[PDB]
Design an enzyme around this catalytic site. Sequence first.
Site, PDB file in Angstrom:
ATOM      1  N   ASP A 112       0.869  -1.181   0.000  1.00  0.00           N
ATOM      2  CA  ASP A 112       0.000   0.000   0.000  1.00  0.00           C
ATOM      3  C   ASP A 112       0.910   1.237   0.000  1.00  0.00           C
ATOM      4  O   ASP A 112       2.151   1.079   0.009  1.00  0.00           O
ATOM      5  CB  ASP A 112      -0.977  -0.048   1.167  1.00  0.00           C
ATOM      6  N   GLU A 169     -11.641   6.084   3.732  1.00  0.00           N
ATOM      7  CA  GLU A 169     -10.668   5.554   4.709  1.00  0.00           C
ATOM      8  C   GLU A 169     -10.723   6.437   5.952  1.00  0.00           C
ATOM      9  O   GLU A 169     -11.819   6.605   6.467  1.00  0.00           O
ATOM     10  CB  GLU A 169      -9.314   5.459   4.013  1.00  0.00           C
TER      11      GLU A 169
HETATM   12  C1  LIG Z   1      -4.304   7.560  -3.345  1.00  0.00           C
HETATM   13  O1  LIG Z   1      -3.803   8.943  -3.333  1.00  0.00           O
HETATM   14  C2  LIG Z   1      -3.156   9.111  -2.111  1.00  0.00           C
HETATM   15  O2  LIG Z   1      -3.874   8.060  -1.544  1.00  0.00           O
HETATM   16  C3  LIG Z   1      -3.681   7.792  -0.201  1.00  0.00           C
HETATM   17  C4  LIG Z   1      -4.951   6.944  -0.034  1.00  0.00           C
HETATM   18  S1  LIG Z   1      -4.178   5.408   0.274  1.00  0.00           S
HETATM   19  C5  LIG Z   1      -4.039   3.855  -0.591  1.00  0.00           C
HETATM   20  O3  LIG Z   1      -3.804   4.284  -1.937  1.00  0.00           O
HETATM   21  C6  LIG Z   1      -3.669   3.202  -2.844  1.00  0.00           C
HETATM   22  C7  LIG Z   1      -3.153   3.784  -4.154  1.00  0.00           C
HETATM   23  O4  LIG Z   1      -3.985   4.879  -4.532  1.00  0.00           O
HETATM   24  C8  LIG Z   1      -5.033   2.514  -2.915  1.00  0.00           C
HETATM   25  O5  LIG Z   1      -5.031   1.557  -3.990  1.00  0.00           O
HETATM   26  C9  LIG Z   1      -5.313   1.896  -1.527  1.00  0.00           C
HETATM   27  O6  LIG Z   1      -6.544   1.154  -1.522  1.00  0.00           O
HETATM   28  C10 LIG Z   1      -5.287   2.959  -0.403  1.00  0.00           C
HETATM   29  O7  LIG Z   1      -5.295   2.403   0.950  1.00  0.00           O
HETATM   30  C11 LIG Z   1      -3.531   9.062   0.659  1.00  0.00           C
HETATM   31  O8  LIG Z   1      -2.664   8.927   1.821  1.00  0.00           O
HETATM   32  C12 LIG Z   1      -2.797  10.171   0.002  1.00  0.00           C
HETATM   33  O9  LIG Z   1      -2.889  11.243   0.921  1.00  0.00           O
HETATM   34  C13 LIG Z   1      -3.418  10.397  -1.324  1.00  0.00           C
HETATM   35  O10 LIG Z   1      -2.760  11.516  -1.851  1.00  0.00           O
END
Ligand SMILES: CO[C@@H]1O[C@H](CS[C@@H]2O[C@H](CO)[C@@H](O)[C@H](O)[C@H]2O)[C@@H](O)[C@H](O)[C@H]1O
Length: 606
Positions: free
Chosen positions: A289, A495
């Site tokens: 992740d 989330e």
């Molecule tokens: C996604 O953009 C950034 O996302 C995280 C959300 S977290 C994590 O992201 C993965 C890739 O996008 C997902 O596939 C997964 O399911 C999620 O848990 C956030 O921390 C950032 O702030 C945001 O810019």
Amino acid sequence: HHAADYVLYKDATKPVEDRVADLLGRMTLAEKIGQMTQIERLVATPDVLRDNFIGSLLSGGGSVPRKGATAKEWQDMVDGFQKACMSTRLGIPMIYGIDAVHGQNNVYGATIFPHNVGLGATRDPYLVKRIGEATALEVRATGIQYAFAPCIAVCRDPRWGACYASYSEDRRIVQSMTELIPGLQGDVPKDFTSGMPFVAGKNKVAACAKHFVGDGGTVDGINENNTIINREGLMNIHMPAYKNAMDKGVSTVMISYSSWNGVKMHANQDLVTGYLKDTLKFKGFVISDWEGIDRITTPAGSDYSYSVKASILAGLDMIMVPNKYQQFISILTGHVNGGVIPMSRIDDAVTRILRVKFTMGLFENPYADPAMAEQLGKQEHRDLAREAARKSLVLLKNGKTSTDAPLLPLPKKAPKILVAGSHADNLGYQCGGWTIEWQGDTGRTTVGTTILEAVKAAVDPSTVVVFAENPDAEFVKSGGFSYAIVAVGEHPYTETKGDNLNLTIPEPGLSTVQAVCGGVRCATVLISGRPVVVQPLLAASDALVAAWLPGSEGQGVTDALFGDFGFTGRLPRTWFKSVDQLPMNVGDAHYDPLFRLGYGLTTNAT
Ligand SMILES: CO[C@@H]1O[C@H](CS[C@@H]2O[C@H](CO)[C@@H](O)[C@H](O)[C@H]2O)[C@@H](O)[C@H](O)[C@H]1O
Ligand SMILES: *[C@@H]1O[C@H](CO)[C@@H](O)[C@H](O)[C@H]1NC(C)=O
Ligand SMILES: *[C@@H]1O[C@H](CO)[C@@H](O)[C@H](O)[C@H]1NC(C)=O
Ligand SMILES: *[C@@H]1O[C@H](CO)[C@@H](O)[C@H](O)[C@H]1NC(C)=O
């Protein structure tokens, strides 16, 4: 097999395992750790991609070339990056990933399907497979080859801000809904070996069973926290869908931020190598992740050198860094140079990344198909999404007493009707999280049809439709209305932002329903990613619909309200009386629901 410049890994007729082994055996250490590196498009440039031998890019939530970009703009950006990768000594194409979790949801004008909780209401795996097919077309329309989906979390507590991304609190419903996988990827051959990756080709995408494992079982549904449960219960609730995903050839698995009994998944060798690779026989790649390895330590990022050691020795193959790729490459290089991470661990990670890339056809079709651009937002996909929205709806009440004329279905012909509420004309609210922005957004953020627009499209031409977002009791009592439709609910979230201990919808909501329903028979539409406190909404309403987060096609709401189709959805979660009861799931000793899992009232098509 012929010309003097012949290189086996570049021969499309040779078997995958021979092309993998042939390529791996030519790679430097730098080329190997390059493959294991995924970076945000926000930090990528040609030179970065080429000089670091980068294996993967992603768009995180909201990471787009610009606001309102066409499918062609997305294709040109991806091709731009891919041209750089293909210019390296070995010409290894990158794989580009994105969160397409209810359609190609970061993209403007993409079809937006109900979120998973609503799809769980449908008990229709074949409908979810069809959604997987349409999503793959819409992802390939933008030049993207990899979707971070499906979320096969089993949400056991709806205070979790990702509860909506879970099809159900019942592992059996989550297992059935893994049909998303062969939708996105294509059906595996008849012969297929469970745990082998599979993608049919350039019109399908690689999929991702996430987040491994027990993302849905955290204490007080606190996002990223500790799942406290014995081996037997992790294996009975949170694991089973992973086996279904192996049988359907899911190409990747993303690891959870969460811990199992105080052990970070991102450092858990027993579960990542012992179980997923050596027991379930997973042969695709395991991805982190987002800053997942950073979060192994407290504070996060306080010993990145550890983070790399523990994550790579646990068996992770590809790291979603995603920004500081220089530190990631330097530190993994040093650990390999010092004999702390053996070359065999690097070779196994690169074997799995290349296996997926070769299998899915990426070396034969590294570039986008401009002819796929018209797939984005295609009316056939919208019609599918509309069908799903409609089937997601759970009728919770349809008459205030057993003796009343049932309110639903409503007539299309009446002199004057009221459409009201914060959610009756707000496309963003009805899509929720992971729509255009990460946290979703408010208002007219993409192409679609709100509840108000669906009502106007449905009713008889003589029917006067009045809109008032928050009308008072006097306005309703004086307006001459036959009935009101009133739509209220949760704001968009994702989330941790949607972790919520009290689960009561924001005002105005209850007040607008009490004001409307006090003056005229009302059908209340509840827009939510999860059960919320509902007795007061019930007490006021003649009829109440749980519509969840139905997406862009609002006419799926009106398809049932007006009797074109009967209501068929069944709760895929327990509806609680009070948050104090939680956690509380079908099966527990102390089981006292307002509405049990599987409840839903029906109607007939008029
Ligand atoms: C996604 O953009 C950034 O996302 C995280 C959300 S977290 C994590 O992201 C993965 C890739 O996008 C997902 O596939 C997964 O399911 C999620 O848990 C956030 O921390 C950032 O702030 C945001 O810019
Ligand atoms: C769970 O959340 C608390 C704060 O709410 C945090 O400090 C703690 O470290 C978390 N536990 C785990 C194992 O993630
Ligand atoms: C309940 O919790 C949410 C999220 O933590 C908060 O924003 C909201 O204002 C709270 N509602 C009440 C009624 O206290
Ligand atoms: C709806 O159809 C079912 C199925 O035949 C029937 O049992 C029921 O009486 C019908 N109800 C109404 C209101 O038409």
